[PDB]
């Protein structure tokens, strides 16, 4: 068999299209408040789950995937807010690096985003990111590669957008990527974080998020499936 | 044998006294960027580790303790900032409930601290908290029981203190308790979060934190050991 693959979203809406697109029989397995969908696709075991929103939920679920299910790589798929003009609604990006943008130990003179015995930026798989870019090029679709900023707040203001761009040079904002990628690094598991834009993280981001959740989630899911087809 | 006990701190300084106080032989076992210290004490297996600071670190470590080591209860020991006049430097409290004070999905009209498919407050073990209070009473020391607010920022301002008190009626602030307790709840593992005050979470909190880390960490550790002696 091929290498077992964990596939993660944050919300049920992000994994519904994934389950449908793979089209195989899934066994549901409950663990730690999550439901894991276990199946076989192209001679690979795939484990699919949504974590629920935010850093704690996604850290927990990723750790479970690795420790309880023994996944050998993790692909994350979902929606995000754009911080750059060139990332429009529905556009895709993969995270070259991620940061926890809400971490603040500045009282001890640490840079924002930094925690002792850790680092500001978290790395992802160069191999998976390069695969993503090749697939995008062949499909003739755009694919940005940049920094994704993750925190436990839904960002919907110009001020916070300006901070994320100025402090971290982030291209997009969401609430799970950094934690998923962090856990994968700690366990030596290759990770790719893929996001489709559904809003511009500004004052109207809530309405845009609602309008485009279904389409953006499907866009990311379809692309994730195209990556698995090449693995 | 008795029930296996996980013992957690956030920083090395918080677990050093724990290891010394138990005084038994520990085997060091690395996993996921953490070092777990495994030993036997009063016919109980104890697993001791520091998570590193913050929600992601502590979520990861707690999940590892439960999934990889199969602990049957988790006791957390460490230092915190006071939000109430009656909690002075060195004073102890146990968390009756915890909240993630930096969670903000208000763009979707959710209450602060709330995430869909979750809850604002996380519960802890009534049994362990009651044990703590009995021990405190017998030792003739004060022990507060209240809400602990956890977030990924070191709090050092009157404005943020006022928010924590007004929004959550929190008694103390720290950066790991809510995540540890959250993971324990998801896995059905009893949890007690114990903290000793080392600062007042105000403009001078950084200096106070440094001055009292050693003493406050030891105060919490000694009390945690006294609980284990009754288990
Ligand atoms: C309902 S909370 C937003 C959910 O969508 C993602 N997301 C999309 N746009 C944004 C944004 N503007 N700010 C934060 N997270 C975002 C986050 O990862 C989370 O799972
Ligand atoms: C060095 S970051 C502070 C460490 O001590 C705890 N802590 C103590 N006082 C405070 C405070 N004022 N604000 C946040 N965390 C605190 C947090 O849980 C963390 O592990
Ligand atoms: Cl905002
Ligand atoms: Cl503050």
Curated annotation (Swiss-Prot), chains A, B:
| Keyword terms of this UniProt record | Amino-acid biosynthesis, Hydrolase, Menaquinone biosynthesis, Methionine biosynthesis
The record lists the catalysed reaction(s) as: 6-amino-6-deoxyfutalosine + H2O = dehypoxanthine futalosine + adenine; S-adenosyl-L-homocysteine + H2O = S-(5-deoxy-D-ribos-5-yl)-L-homocysteine + adenine; S-methyl-5'-thioadenosine + H2O = 5-(methylsulfanyl)-D-ribose + adenine; 5'-deoxyadenosine + H2O = 5-deoxy-D-ribose + adenine
**Matching Gene3D superfamilies, A to Z?**
Nucleoside phosphorylase domain (3.40.50.1580)
Q: GO annotations under biological process? A: L-methionine salvage from methylthioadenosine; L-methionine salvage from S-adenosylmethionine; menaquinone biosynthetic process; nucleoside catabolic process
GO MF terms listed in the record are: 6-amino-6-deoxyfutalosine hydrolase activity; adenosylhomocysteine nucleosidase activity; methylthioadenosine nucleosidase activity
Can you tell me which family this protein belongs to? Belongs to the PNP/UDP phosphorylase family. MtnN subfamily.
First-level EC class = hydrolase
Q: What is its EC number?
A: 3.2.2.30, 3.2.2.9
**What protein name applies here?**
Aminodeoxyfutalosine nucleosidase
- The region annotated as signal peptide is none
- Location of the active site: 14, 199
* Organism, scientific name: Helicobacter pylori (strain J99 / ATCC 700824) (Campylobacter pylori J99)
How would you summarize the oligomeric state and partners of this protein?
Answer: Homodimer.
- What is the role of this chain? Catalyzes the direct conversion of aminodeoxyfutalosine (AFL) into dehypoxanthine futalosine (DHFL) and adenine via the hydrolysis of the N-glycosidic bond; this reaction seems to represent an essential step in the menaquinone biosynthesis pathway in Helicobacter species. Also catalyzes the hydrolysis of 5'-methylthioadenosine (MTA) to adenine and 5'-methylthioribose. Can also probably use S-adenosylhomocysteine (SAH) as substrate, leading to adenine and S-ribosylhomocysteine.
**Which CDD domains has this protein been placed in?**
MTAN (cd09008)
The pathway this protein participates in, as annotated, is: Quinol/quinone metabolism; menaquinone biosynthesis; Amino-acid biosynthesis; L-methionine biosynthesis via salvage pathway; S-methyl-5-thio-alpha-D-ribose 1-phosphate from S-methyl-5'-thioadenosine (hydrolase route): step 1/2
Its organism's taxonomic lineage begins at: Bacteria, Pseudomonadati, Campylobacterota, Epsilonproteobacteria, Campylobacterales
Q: In the UniProt record, which is one GO cellular component term?
A: cytosol
Q: Which residues bind substrate?
A: 81, 155, 175-176
Free-text activity regulation comment from the record: Is inhibited by the transition state analog BuT-DADMe-ImmA. This compound is also able to inhibit H.pylori growth and is more efficient than antibiotics commonly used in ulcer therapy.
Q: Which InterPro entries match?
A: MTA_SAH_Nsdase (IPR010049), Nucleoside_phosphorylase_d (IPR000845), Nucleoside_phosphorylase_sf (IPR035994)
């Amino acid at each position: 068999m091929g290498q077992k693959i964990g596939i993660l979203g944050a919300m049920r809406e992000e994994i519904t299209p994934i389950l449908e697109l793979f089209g195989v029989d899934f066994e549901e397995i409950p663990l730690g408040g999550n439901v894991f969908h276990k199946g076989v696709y192209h001679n690979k075991e795939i484990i699919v789950a949504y974590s629920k929103i935010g850093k704690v939920h996604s850290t927990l679920t990723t750790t479970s995937m690795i420790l309880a299910f023994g996944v050998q790589k993790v692909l994350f798929s979902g929606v995000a807010g754009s911080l750059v003009k060139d990332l429009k609604i529905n556009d895709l990006l993969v995270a070259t690096q991620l940061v926890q943008h809400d971490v603040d130990l500045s009282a001890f003179d640490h840079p924002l985003g930094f925690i002792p015995e850790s680092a500001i930026f978290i790395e992802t798989s160069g191999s998976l990111n390069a695969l993503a870019k090749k697939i995008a090029n062949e499909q003739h679709i755009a694919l940005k590669e940049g920094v994704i900023a993750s925190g436990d707040q839904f960002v919907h203001s110009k001020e916070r957008k300006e901070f994320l761009v100025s402090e971290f040079k982030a291209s997009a904002v969401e609430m799970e990527g950094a934690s998923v990628a962090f856990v994968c690094q700690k366990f030596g598991v290759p990770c790719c974080v893929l996001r489709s834009i559904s809003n511009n993280a500004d004052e109207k981001a809530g309405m845009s998020f609602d309008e485009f959740l279904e389409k953006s989630a499907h866009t990311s899911a379809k692309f994730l499936k195209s990556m698995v087809d090449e693995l």
